[PDB]
Structure formats: C-alpha cells, structure tokens
C-alpha cells in the first residue's frame, strides 16, 4: 500500500514543486482570482520560494511539503534554493494574496 498524493490543492497549501531541469523546489499554491483568464484544466498557480518565480503545474508535479520535507528538503546550490528552504519555513505567506 502507498498513499496517493493530493489530486486537488487549495490556495496557501505548501508543497514541493518539480519542473524539468530543476530539483524539487519549495513552493506554494497561490490563488486564482476570479474575473481573470481561466487556466488550463487541473493546473495550479505556483509560487516558488527563493526566486519568487511562478508557473502552472498539475498535481503530478506537486508534493505536499510536510510529507516530503526530508526527501526534498536538503540544501542544494541552485540559485534561490536555500533561500527558498528558509522562506517555506519562516515566511511562507510572502506575497500571498489568497488570504
């Protein structure tokens, strides 16, 4: 038996986000304000800590932060990464408009 990862997320949720070419990255599910252009189905607006970049990703590339912390939460020399580790713990609301 193996627990599935979430297939839905809510704004404010803290995760690790994975994109091609980069390590699993400390990140947050931002909100999608209504009265805006709809996103592609099942994609969430992502905020990366450290770099403060954004993207849209589905659940396959998302790993809930607390659950995957010590598989993905090791230091890494990529620019922003270690700052991101710091932010997901001490300031995970930074620029968060959700609430």
């Amino acid at each position: 038996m193996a627990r599935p990862r979430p297939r839905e997320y809510k704004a404010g949720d803290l995760v690790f986000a994975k994109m091609k070419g980069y390590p699993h990255w400390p990140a947050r599910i931002d909100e999608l304000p209504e009265g805006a252009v709809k996103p592609p189905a099942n994609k969430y607006p992502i905020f990366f800590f450290g770099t403060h970049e954004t993207a849209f990703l589905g659940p396959k590339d998302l790993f809930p932060y607390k659950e995957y912390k010590d598989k993905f939460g090791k230091s890494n020399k990529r620019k922003g990464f270690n700052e991101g580790l710091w932010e997901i713990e001490n300031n995970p609301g930074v620029k968060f408009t959700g609430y």
């Binding site: 994109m19 992502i46 990366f48 770099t51 403060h52 970049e53 954004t54 993207a55």
Partner: peptide
C-alpha cells in the same frame, strides 16, 4: 519574479 517556463 517572472514566469518559470
């Protein structure tokens, strides 16, 4: 920051 594409 910008869009991580």
């Amino acid at each position: 920051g910008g869009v991580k594409k």
